[PDB]
Design a protein around this nucleic acid. Structure first.
Ligand code: MN
Ligand code: MN
Ligand code: MN
Ligand code: MN
Lengths: 163, 163
DNA sequence: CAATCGTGGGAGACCTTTGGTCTCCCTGCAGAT
DNA sequence: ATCTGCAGGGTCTGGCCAGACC
DNA sequence: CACGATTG
């Protein structure tokens, strides 16, 4: 009954579903660092691992993480950060005792009927609100689509269905 | 007394130096996976974690990892893998109780006088053989330059000097 | 703070800082000795 | 196996093609 | 997706 979902990008989130139906969602911790004399956001390694140590999810809990698949038209910094966020999350999840199952974005979108949307991030927040109504106040901003994708990944791995 | 050096690429290595002067060097564990219907080498996350947790180095031991600096002329997959390997190693080292200090490749090269070499991989192997003569049999192949790079990073953090 | 937009990008360490100069790692294939 | 050369590249799923996505 | 802006 324990399922973890991870949206790994810099505005992403981690969702935890418990066997009693309750859910948690945490924004991905980040820090500001200096790269090439400008400011960049990067995931906070220590806060991520400290977040995972304090979860009540037992070892062997499956973590469903979105498969890294950046676009060819994305720049090389987008490719680096997609890879960096992917490896940092996977290593943190494996070291915390969790079994990592990568899920393509096409898989959970087709599962919830979210393919070919004009507003995919808004539809994600709507679908996660319907699946997790106690998280509806945590999904009202446009920036909360990372929270929704983490919830939908965990909802996919748990086998929940929309009404 | 205890210093760890990490060369994070797919042919890289991790070197561990003990306060009695002895040394160990392990090739980076990897697996073959399928990406876009071809075979790719990716770092073996679970084997890296259990390698770090089998070390006798106490928690708080500083792990010097080569700083990520892919070239602008490198392709977007090289940027992805450089980022992925960097984040996978950093999260693995932090979760195992080690403190991570990134070191630019120019830093330990200048400290050992290896800059502007026409055969830099050969020179790293010869420099590591002189610093760690019980690893001379483990540095005889050209592919062993990742073992040398990890040994030299660890030698930089320990303050060793060449004769 | 929160949202929107347009394009896809290096980064780093000294030298003798206040910018300039110069340096450095790879991946992913194919083929050959 | 081990080394060399060279240019810098998507990847995925639902069934080689088609069409989808961060 | 990232990055480096601009918008109120
Ligand atoms: Mn995502
Ligand atoms: Mn996201
Ligand atoms: Mn290296
Ligand atoms: Mn290397």
């Amino acid at each position: 009954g324990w399922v973890i979902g991870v949206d790994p990008d810099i505005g992403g989130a981690i969702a935890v579903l418990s066997p009693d139906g309750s859910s948690q969602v945490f924004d991905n911790p980040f820090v500001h660092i200096v790269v090439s004399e400008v400011i960049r956001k990067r995931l906070d390694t220590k806060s991520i691992i400290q977040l995972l140590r304090g979860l009540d999810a037992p070892p062997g809990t499956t973590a469903y993480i979105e498969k890294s698949s950046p676009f060819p038209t994305d720049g090389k910094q987008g490719w680096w950060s997609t890879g960096f966020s992917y490896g940092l999350w996977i290593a943190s999840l494996v070291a915390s005792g969790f079994s990592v199952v990568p899920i393509a974005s096409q898989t959970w979108k087709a599962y919830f009927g979210l393919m070919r949307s004009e507003t995919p991030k808004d539809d994600s927040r709507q679908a996660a609100s319907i699946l997790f109504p106690d998280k509806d106040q945590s999904l009202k901003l446009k920036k909360h689509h990372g929270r929704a994708e983490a919830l939908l990944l965990a909802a996919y791995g748990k086998g929940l269905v929309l009404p």
